[PDB]
Design a protein around this ligand. Structure first.
Ligand code: SF4
Lengths: 115, 148, 95
């Protein structure tokens, strides 16, 4: 927390003045969109393993200055940006649906370099 | 017993034994084997302090070079290589690491030959290396000292 | 060097610094071009004692890519620990 940081050190990236709850209502959203995905999905178990877990201290600890080393994710103003891509990514494999078997096995021994 | 420096136990191929180990051992196949040598043909050769062990097997290893049929390369090449490097050892023209180098090639031609002469050559020099090691170091020390 | 103290003063004042301390050219400080013969060292494995190439087989010791999964509770990991935010240079933090 403390005095609002004038600049985050990355041009284009802006300092958000309400970062803790922005992480909160983002982090709920991936948990929300994860609801559609099946339980057997490998994505979901990994998602919930780091979503509400990392929703933990941000819910508990409110000082973003201490929150830097809570997630080892760098500056908070890009962590919420990173959470945005995770929310974005969750939408992506809501369509890819990758837990089916391979579309096609690799044709003959194409791999196995050298030739 | 004071005079004798070492004794060829049972044959030229069998590594020579010094007084330090041959003070009690019985001349039998089993005791000779555990004495890092062999009874072989019971060709016991006595030799005193006055003679040099290096000049002793010098003529011995020279005879081995004069015999090898040359069929397999380890005996054909190594034994002559042994003769040249050991000829330097007589005067002492080698650094301390050459004894390990001589030991290395001695293990190289040991067993790798078609016949047992190749190892039959390894054993005498191998026994000389393991027993009169300080003698080789001081003989080489005199070589560099007198030819400084 | 040649240059008299008068215009040396002109260079020093106009540039705001003393240039006679170090100049962009060279002088007698350069090592002369007839350096004595060297005695370059020998290799670490140049010993004639145990030196078998069966030990150092850099080309040979390489192994195929290790098979771990092929087409033919759990925990979440990362390819490496996340980076550490390095601190400012103690010598000079802010230019
Ligand atoms: S070890 Fe035997 S086969 Fe080989 S070169 Fe010597 S005598 Fe010939």
């Amino acid at each position: 927390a403390g005095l609002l940081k004038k600049t985050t050190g990355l041009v284009g990236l802006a300092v958000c003045e309400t970062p803790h709850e922005r992480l909160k209502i983002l982090y709920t959203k991936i948990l929300d969109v994860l609801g559609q995905i099946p339980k057997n999905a490998a994505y979901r178990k990994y998602t919930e393993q780091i979503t509400n877990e990392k929703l933990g201290m941000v819910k508990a600890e409110p000082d973003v200055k201490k929150l830097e080393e809570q997630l080892q994710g760098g500056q908070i103003e890009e962590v919420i940006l990173q959470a945005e891509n995770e929310l974005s990514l969750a939408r992506k494999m809501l369509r890819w649906k990758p837990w089916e078997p391979l579309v096609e096995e690799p044709p003959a021994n194409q791999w196995k370099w050298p030739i | 017993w004071d005079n004798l420096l070492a004794v060829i136990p049972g044959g030229s191929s069998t590594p020579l034994i010094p007084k330090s180990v041959c003070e009690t051992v019985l001349m039998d196949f089993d005791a000779l084997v555990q004495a890092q040598t062999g009874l072989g043909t019971a060709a016991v050769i006595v030799m005193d302090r006055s003679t040099d062990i290096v000049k002793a097997i010098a003529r011995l290893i020279e005879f081995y070079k004069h015999e090898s049929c040359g069929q397999c390369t380890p005996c054909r090449e190594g034994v002559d290589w042994m003769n040249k490097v050991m000829a330097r050892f007589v005067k002492g023209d080698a650094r301390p690491a050459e004894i390990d180098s001589l030991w290395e090639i001695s293990k190289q031609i040991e067993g790798h030959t078609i016949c047992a002469l190749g190892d039959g050559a390894a054993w005498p020099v191998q026994g000389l290396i393991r027993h009169f090691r300080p003698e080789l170091e001081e003989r080489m020390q005199q070589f560099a000292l007198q030819h400084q | 060097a040649s240059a008299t103290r008068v215009i040396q003063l002109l260079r020093n004042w106009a540039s705001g610094r003393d240039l006679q301390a170090k100049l962009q050219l060279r002088y007698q400080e350069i090592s002369k071009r007839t350096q004595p013969p060297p005695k370059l060292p020998v290799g670490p494995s140049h010993k004639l004692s145990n030196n078998y190439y069966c030990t150092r087989d850099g080309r040979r010791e390489a192994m195929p890519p290790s098979i771990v999964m092929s087409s033919q509770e759990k925990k979440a990991v990362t390819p490496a620990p996340p980076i550490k935010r390095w601190e400012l240079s103690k010598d000079q933090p802010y230019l």
